[PDB]
Amino acid sequence: SAMIEARQVSELSTRIISSVQMLSNAQNEQERKEAGRVLFEQLESLLTHIKELGGESFDSKLLDALESNVQNVINNLAELGVTVERKLWLAKEIDTRVEEMRLLSEELEQLTRTLDLTERLHELHLLAFKMLNQIEEARTLTNVDRIQQIQTAFENNLKIMKRRVLAVEDPTRSKQMSQLLTELGKRQVVFTILLQQYENNEQSQQLMQKTLELFSELNSTVNKLVDDS
Numbered sequence: 250s251a252m253i254e255a256r257q258v259s260e261l262s263t264r265i266i267s268s269v270q271m272l273s274n275a276q277n278e279q280e281r282k283e284a285g286r287v288l289f290e291q292l293e294s295l296l297t298h299i300k301e302l303g304g305e306s307f308d309s310k311l312l313d314a315l316e317s318n319v320q321n322v323i324n325n326l327a328e329l330g331v332t333v334e335r336k337l338w339l340a341k342e343i344d345t346r347v348e349e350m351r352l353l354s355e356e357l358e359q360l361t362r363t364l365d366l367t368e369r370l371h372e373l374h375l376l377a378f379k380m381l382n383q384i385e386e387a388r389t390l391t392n393v394d395r396i397q398q399i400q401t402a403f404e405n406n407l408k409i410m411k412r413r414v415l416a417v418e419d420p421t422r423s424k425q426m427s428q429l430l431t432e433l434g435k436r437q438v439v440f441t442i443l444l445q446q447y448e449n450n451e452q453s454q455q456l457m458q459k460t461l462e463l464f465s466e467l468n469s470t471v472n473k474l475v476d477d478s
Contacts, residue, residue, distance in 0.1 A: 251475045254302040258471050261295035262464045269326070269460050272333055273453065281337055285330060292326060302471060311474050318467040325456060325463050332453040339446040343388055346439040353436075354381040357429045360422055373413055373426070380406045380433070387440065393447050400440035407434055 268291055272284035299319055306312055358377040361370040380403055387399040411430050417423040 251302060251305060251477055254298045255468075255471050255475050257298045258295060258302065259468050261291055261298065262468055265291050265295060265326075266461065266464060269329065269457060272329070273457060275333065275337070278337065281333060288326070292323070299471070302474060306474060306477065308474070308477075311470065315467075315470045315474065318463070318470050322460075322463050322467055325460050329453065329456045329460065332449060332456060335449055336446070336453060339442060339449060343439060343442050343446060346436055346442065347384055347388055350384050350433060350436045350439065351381060353429050353433050354378075354384075357426055357433070360426050360429070366418055369413070369416065373410070373417075376406060376410050376413065380410070384439070387443055390443075391447070391450075393444065396440065396443050396447060400437075400443075403440070404437060407437070 265288060268284060268288035272281065272288055275281035275284050296319070299315070303312055303315060354377050358374050361374040361377070363370060383399050383403045383406070387396060387403070390396050390399070407430065411427065411434075414423055414426045414430065417426065
């Protein structure tokens with residue numbers, strides 16, 4: 250009976266722990282909402298069995314430990330929900346910005362298409378490809394010092410690039426390249442969104458680790474309550 254409630258709490262714990270992995274592997278809003286709907290139904294059932302279990306209890310010290318184990322699980326799960334949703338918007342903000350940056354880069358490299366104007370247009374062409382490779386590499390990095398180094402490296406390339414387009418002779422080419430570079434330079438805010446996505450991923454991993462420890466502490470208090478036999 251206290252044993253009947255404890256077995257259900259222990260099995261809903263392991264289910265919630267899988268729904269949390271489902272939630273953190275969600276790739277879009279539909280999946281994120283569907284994993285969140287399942288996790289809330291399972292937490293609601295877990296809470297009715299916890300309530301049955303304590304209704305039949307007297308040890309107020311145990312009951313205080315159980316109430317604080319339950320509040321910790323509920324806060325840990327509400328915080329991971331905010332984190333996971335912030336993870337999908339941040340990934341979006343970054344991909345939209347990388348795609349605007351890829352279009353401006355291609356357009357810049359096409360203005361360089363046609364004696365020493367030639368090797369000069371070819372160097373600008375190579376530099377626009379290397380800044381686009383930097384941005385494609387930067388959104389795949391999981392190390393934070395590397396993210397910051399690519400950021401200052403892309404910024405120094407952008408400076409070299411704008412000083413090379415001043416040496417460009419055709420007046421019109423010169424200015425169409427120069428305004429693309431100033432559009433590209435405005436999108437450099439994507440590297441501070443890459444740093445927020447790193448910090449949010451790290452906070453979310455720490456939170457999932459805390460979920461396993463919190464659930465292990467919750468069942469360890471309910472097993473103590475069932476030595477009421």
